[PDB]
C-alpha cells in the first residue's frame, strides 16, 4: 500500500507530464492485434465490424524507478489517464471505436508500459465474396494520427495476428490474418509515415 | 450524520487511496451472478443480450473501523468512485456493457465491501437450436482485465447462478445456469489467470 | 445575487456533504409518477418503453436556514450534483434510463428538497393482449438500490398515478395507473426492503 | 487580443458566476425557432424527429461593460460554459435532444446574450393523416424546467416560425408553423408556468 | 522533453488564452476536404452519411516562438483543448458529427496550426437517382457557427476535393467533388457570412 502510493506520487505529481515524442527523442511503439469475432458484415455500406484486443507497448525514461527504493516493487497498474498514451488510430474507420475494456495500463520499473484495450471497430470493407469458398480479404491501416515516422516508429512483434482468442462459432471463419509494418510518403507531406496494416481474409462458416 | 461524516473523512481524505492488490498482498474477490432476462438473441451476428445483477464482494483492512468510536455505525453506503473496485470484465463482449443501476457500494466495519451492479451485456453466442426442446448452451468468462491470479483470486460462493430474479415471461426459459471458477495460462503472459465462467443453457418459452 | 450566493456558500462549502441516511437517522422519500406516453411496445423482447416525470421529495436538516438572515429567501434552485439525491431505481429495466430534463433540484428554507427528472425507461413487460379491448397490465418496482427499509422509507402521496400530462394521441391508451408502496423481505437478506410498484393497464388507441 | 482578454477576465474570473433569476430580479428570455427538416416520422410509436436552430436571447446586467474602457469592443464570442444559460426544454420529448452545433454564445456591451443551438428532437406526435392532402398537425411546448413565470418570462419575437432554412427536398412539406407564448398553472404548484408552444402542420411531399 | 515542456508552459500557462477573432483582428482559416467513403444513403429520410478528414489551417501570433530559445524545436503536437480552434460546422447536418480521430493539432514556430479531424457526417440529401448512370448530386455548407465574414474568412486552397484517400470498393463512386468558397448577405443583417460549399455528384 504505502510503498506503491509513494512511487505513484513521485512519478505523476512531481514532474510536469510527458509531452510526447519529437524528432530529437523519437519513440518506438509496438502493436499486436488479437482478433476475437467478426461480428457483422453489411453489404449495403461496405462496413465490417470487428472485435479485438490491441496490445500497445512503449518505453519512457520519465517512468523508470529503482525497485529497491520502493519496496522491491517491479511493476504497477494505473488508469491510462494518469499517463501519455500513443494516438494509434484506424485510418479507414466509419464509426467511433467502441471501447470494451477498462482503460488501464501496466508500468514496469524500467519505464516500459503495456496497454491492451479491447475494441469494436467498424471499418471500410467490401465483403462481396464472403459466402464463396475462397473468401474475401479486408484491410485497415493503424497509424499515429499526428506523428510521422520521425517522431513515432510503429512495429509489430510478429506478422501473425494472434487468433487464439477468436470465437469458435463466429458467423465467419478466419483464413488469413496478418499485421505488417509499412512505410509511405505522400505527395502532401515531406516526412515518412509508418503504419501497421491489418489484413484479414475470411468467409462465412459452414 | 455528523458521525458518519467523520468516519468517511478518516477513511478517504486522510490516507492516500488504496492502490489495489500486488503479488505481496493479493486480494480475493467473490462473484455471484443473478440472471434476470435473456432479452434478445441475434442469429445474424451470434450476439446475445443478457441482463443481470453481479454481486462482487471483497475485503480491505484500510476500511476497518470500530463501531464504538463512530456512533455504533456498523456499515455505510458510498459512491463507488470514492473507493477501489475490481476491474471485472466480460471477456467475450461485443458492445460496451450498459449499466442499469446506481454505482454505489456498501462498506462494513470489518472492512468488507459489497457492490452489485445491474448490467446489460451483449456477448458472443451461437444461438441456433434455441427453438429446439434440448435448447442451446452459451458461455462467457468474467475476468480481471489487468490482474493475474497472483494479485486477484476470483471465487464463486456457489456453482448455481441465482435464478430467483429471472423474468417469468421472458421470451427464453433457463434450463441450466452455472458459475464456475477456472484457471488458465495464456501464451502471451507468464502468470496464471483466474476467471469465472458463466454458462447458460436456454430455449424459447412454450406450454 | 449576493444574498443567495452567501446562502449557498454556507450550506455547501462550509459543512461536509450530507453522507446519506443510516438506521439511526433514517430518511423518508416520496415518489409521485407522472405518466406521459407509452412510446413503444416490442413483443419480440417483452420490452416496453415508457416516458414520465418522477417527483422525488425528501427533507434534510443540513439544508435548513432562516429566511431573515438571507434576504427573506424562502427557496433556491441548484444542480443536483451540488446535493445528495436518493438512488431510486427501476428494478426490472432492460436499458439504462435516458434522462430527458435538466438535473436540477429545488431546496426550501425548511430543508425540504424537490427533484423531478423526466425519463425514458425500458422495462420488462409481456405486451400480448395489447390490441384486445380488455388491454394488458404491466408493472415495475422502483426501489432504492442499496438502502433498506431501515435507512430509507419510500411513500407515495397517493395511489393514483397522475395522468394529466399524458399524451392525447399516444399510440396507447391508459386504462389504469397505480403507484403502490410495498414491503418485502427476501431470503438473501435480514432487513425489509420498501418499493413503489408502478402498475399500468393499457391498450391500443381505436376511434 | 489583449483587450478582449482583459474584458473576459473582468467579467468571468472576478465575480462569482451569475446564479440565475429570482422572483426579485426576474429575467426575460426570447425564443425563435428556425425549422430545418422533418427528418422522420414513426407511426408505431407516435414519435417525430425534427431538426432546427433555436435562437435564445436574454439580457443580464452582470454582463454590461463600457466599450470605451475595453478598446471600443461592442461584442464578443464565448463558450456557453463560461456563462449561465436558461434551461429551456421540450416538455414532450421522447429521447434526449441531440446537439448539432457548437455550444457558443454572443455577448454584447449592453449585457444581452444570443445563443442559437442546432438540435435534433424526437417528440410525441400522432402522424396519421400525414399522407392526406390536408396534412397533420403537431405540437411541442418549450418551457423552462425549474423556473416559473415569476422567475423567467418566455416570449416569441413573432408568431411565425422561420421556414427560410427549411430543406427543399425534405420528405415532408410544411403547411403551417407557429410559435405562441402560453401560460398555465399546474395542480402540483402555486406559480404560473410560461411556455412557447411550437405547432407544425405538415404532410408528405408530392 | 524538458525543452518542449518549457515551450508549452510559456505559451499556455503564462498568457491568458487566445479569445478568438474580432472585426479588428480578423482571422483566416483554410479548409480542405478529403473524402473517404460514402457509407450510407437513406431514401426514407433523405439523409446521407459521408466520411472524411477536414484539414483546417490558421495562424496566430500568440503562438510564435524562436526555435533557438527552445532547443531548435520547430513544431509540436498538442491536444486541441490546449488551444483555440475554429467552430466550423456543417449547416445541414441531421445528427451530431461523429469524431473518428484524436483531437490533436500541430503548432509550428511561425504560429501556424494544422488540425485535421476525421468525421462521419449525416446530412440532408435527396439521393433518388443514385442508381441511375448520370448519378445524383449532394451539397452541404461548412460555416463558422458564430462568426461572420468580418471575424473569420474561410478559404479553400483548391476547388478540387481530394479523392486520393477515397475507398476503392465503396458502395458509391464519386463523379464530381468540389469545395467552393461562398458569400451570402441577408437583408436583416449588415455582415457577410462566408461558407465552403461541399458538393458531391456520385452513384452506385
Ligand atoms: O489524407 C491524408 C494523407 C496522409 O495519409 C497517410 C496518413 C497520415 C497520418 N495523418 C492522418 C491524417 C493525415 C493528414 C493531415 C492533414 C491533411 C491530410 C491528411 N492525410 C493524412 C496523411 C498522413 C498525415 C496525417
Ligand atoms: O491474449 C490475451 C488473452 C488472455 O485472455 C485471458 C485473460 C487475460 C487477462 N488480461 C486481459 C487482456 C490480456 C492480454 C494482455 C496482453 C495481450 C493480450 C492479452 N490477452 C489477455 C490474456 C490474459 C492477460 C490479459
Ligand atoms: O436480487 C436482488 C433482488 C432484491 O430486490 C429487493 C431490493 C433490494 C435492494 N438492493 C438492490 C440490489 C439488490 C441485490 C444485491 C445483491 C444481490 C442481489 C440483489 N437484488 C437486490 C435485492 C435487495 C438487495 C439489493
Ligand atoms: O406535474 C408536472 C407537469 C408540469 O409540466 C409542465 C411544465 C412544468 C415545468 N416544470 C417541469 C417539472 C414540473 C414539476 C415540478 C414538480 C412536480 C411536478 C412537476 N411537473 C412539471 C410541471 C410544470 C412545473 C415543473
Ligand atoms: O437561419 C440561419 C441562417 C444563416 O445562415 C448563414 C450562416 C450563419 C451562421 N450562423 C449559423 C446559425 C445562424 C443563425 C443564428 C440564429 C438564427 C438563425 C441563424 N441562421 C444562421 C445564419 C448565419 C448566422 C448563424
Author numbering:
A (entry chain D), D (entry chain A): 20 to 225
B (entry chain C), C (entry chain B): 20 to 226
E (entry chain E): 20 to 223
Task: Quote the original article.
Protein-engineering methods have been exploited to produce a surrogate system for the extracellular neurotransmitter-binding site of a heteromeric human ligand-gated ion channel, the glycine receptor. Acetylcholine-binding protein is a highly conserved ortholog of the pLGIC extracellular ligand-binding domain (ECD) with properties similar to nAChR. Mutations affecting key residues in the orthosteric agonist site at the α1(−)/β(+) interface affect the potency of both activation by glycine and inhibition by strychnine. We therefore set out to generate a high-fidelity surrogate of this α1(−)/β(+) orthosteric binding site using the 2α1:3β stoich­iometry [Fig. 1(a)] by exploiting protein-engineering methods and the thermal stability of acetylcholine-binding protein from Aplysia californica (AcAChBP). Ultimately, the highly stable AcAChBP framework has allowed us to introduce nine amino-acid substitutions that have resulted in a stable surrogate for a heteromeric neurotransmitter site that binds glycine.
Variant II therefore reverted back to Trp164, but with the inclusion of a G162E substitution. The residues now changed (Thr53, Gln74, Tyr110, Ile135 and Gly162) correspond to Phe72, Arg93, Ala146, Ser157 and Glu202 in the human GlyR-α1(−)/β(+) orthosteric site [Figs. 1(b) and 2]. Crystal structures of variant II with HEPES, tropisetron and strychnine revealed that the G162E substitution was accommodated with the structure essentially unperturbed compared with variant I, although now incorporating two charged residues (Arg74 and Glu162) to polarize the binding site such that the principal side is negatively charged and the complementary side is positive. The incorporation of the inter-strand hydrogen bond between Trp164 and Ile135 is likely to support this recovery of thermal stability.
